[PDB]
């Protein structure tokens, strides 16, 4: 049963410099091993065959080598804004075994984001919920903070957030908190803010608005 | 010119038989060698086997053995994916890709095809708008979107405009709920002065419930 590894649970480089991955395993096998990239919620794609080329692939911007117990997939950034994650499969025979694999961690500059706050549907009070969402648009890096506050009181694990896989172009971030409780605790208030405290700012900007204008 | 187009998400009990298809559309040769292939959502891929439409000997990969068998199509050159005996384990994303190295140089993935191995039953989402506030305008630029909530099954495809739309789009992964539930936000950023009557449409599909809805998005 042949195995293989790639060593790197995680990668992260910045936006020009190169990067080389490495991939092992338990045999020796040459001009075989391929390589794909799984683009982020995108079918995985043909990136490499016997550590040659690909069709449709960069000119050069990624290179590797290694057969035996070692290989490794040096990337270098010269036109690259690509952010996805990538595998190394042992094509030479079966099971055709493939490996761990390594996400890419694109650093780039900190971004602030932009804030824009949502009411409830309308046609959501129907059902006596409240979903309220407040949202970030595009920013770095990932650590930051939100808080919930409704005519100044406090609120807590009432309220979910989702954050997005990165951006192609801008290495932006965007997330998305969602406060939710009964129609009944959102009608007994009049005011709604959301604080956020991003590593990228100097004071935390609260913003809020009124119901019925 | 090539496709490799296979059929939507389904969802079964656990102790269910399914047989997967994925298309040729382009490639009618018989020399291409389709290979399976399982993704958890838990990032980790496997190789399930392969086939060649001349004396396909690849049926099976050692750890699944009896789980599944593949088996072709004279019709269509479809490849069939036979699974039964399903369980939880089985829940991943599956694909089928082309690729004769030693006749062509390129190849190509299929959509892909998502399976859910739970006790649930089917449940379309429910889709409630997001309309821009004089708040949500930031230096004459607003933003916009919806929300789905509540679908049992994973696959929610979010267009809008009917696929014609893509700038500034922002698809957030299926949080789940407290409910058991997932949910989910498609916004998109557009300026101040579409507020002349410059309509957008969550054009969102949910295909195992068949629940098909565009709604459309206005202020207030």
């Known amino acids: 049963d042949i195995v293989m590894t790639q060593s790197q649970k995680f990668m992260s480089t910045s936006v020009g410099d190169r990067v080389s991955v490495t991939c092992k395993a338990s045999?020796?096998?040459?001009?075989?091993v391929a390589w794909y990239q799984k683009k982020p919620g995108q079918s995985p794609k043909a990136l490499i065959y016997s550590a040659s080329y690909r069709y449709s692939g960069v000119p050069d911007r990624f290179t590797g080598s290694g057969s035996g117990t070692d290989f490794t997939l040096t990337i270098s950034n010269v036109q690259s804004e690509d952010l996805a994650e990538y595998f190394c499969q042992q094509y030479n025979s079966y099971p055709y075994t493939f490996g761990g694999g390594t996400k890419l961690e694109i650093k780039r500059t900190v971004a602030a984001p932009s804030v824009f706050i949502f009411p409830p549907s309308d046609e959501q009070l129907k059902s006596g919920t409240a979903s309220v969402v407040c949202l970030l648009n595009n920013f770095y890096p990932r650590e930051a903070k939100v808080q919930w506050k409704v005519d100044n009181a406090l609120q807590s694990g009432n309220s979910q957030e989702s954050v997005t896989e990165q951006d192609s172009k801008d290495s932006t971030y965007s997330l998305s908190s969602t406060l939710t409780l009964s129609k009944a605790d959102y009608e007994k208030h009049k005011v709604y803010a959301c604080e956020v405290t991003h590593q990228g700012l100097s004071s935390p900007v609260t913003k809020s608005f009124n119901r019925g204008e | 010119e090539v496709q490799l187009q296979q059929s939507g998400a389904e969802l079964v009990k656990p102790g269910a038989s399914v047989k997967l298809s994925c298309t040729a559309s382009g490639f009618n040769i018989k020399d291409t060698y389709i290979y399976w292939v399982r993704q958890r959502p838990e990032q980790g891929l496997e190789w399930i086997g392969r086939?060649?439409?001349?004396?396909?000997?690849?049926k099976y990969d050692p750890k699944v053995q009896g789980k599944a068998t593949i088996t072709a199509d004279t019709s269509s050159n479809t490849a069939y994916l036979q699974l039964s005996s399903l369980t939880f384990e089985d829940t991943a994303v599956y694909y089928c890709?082309?690729?004769?190295?030693?006749?062509?140089?390129?190849?190509?993935w299929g959509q892909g095809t998502s399976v859910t191995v739970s006790s649930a039953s089917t449940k379309g989402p429910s889709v409630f708008p997001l309309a821009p506030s004089s708040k949500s305008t930031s230096g004459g630029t607003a933003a916009l979107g919806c929300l789905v909530k509540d679908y049992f099954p994973e696959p929610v495809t979010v267009s809008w405009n009917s696929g014609a739309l893509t700038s500034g789009v922002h698809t957030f992964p299926a949080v789940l709920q407290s409910s058991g539930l997932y949910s989910l936000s498609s916004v998109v950023t557009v300026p101040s002065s579409s507020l002349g009557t410059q309509t957008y449409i969550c054009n969102v599909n949910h295909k195992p419930s068949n629940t098909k809805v565009d709604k459309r998005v206005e202020p207030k």
């Open positions: 890709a082309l690729e004769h190295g030693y006749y062509d140089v390129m190849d190509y």
């Open positions: 086939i060649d439409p001349a004396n396909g000997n690849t």
């Open positions: 045999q020796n096998v040459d001009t075989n």
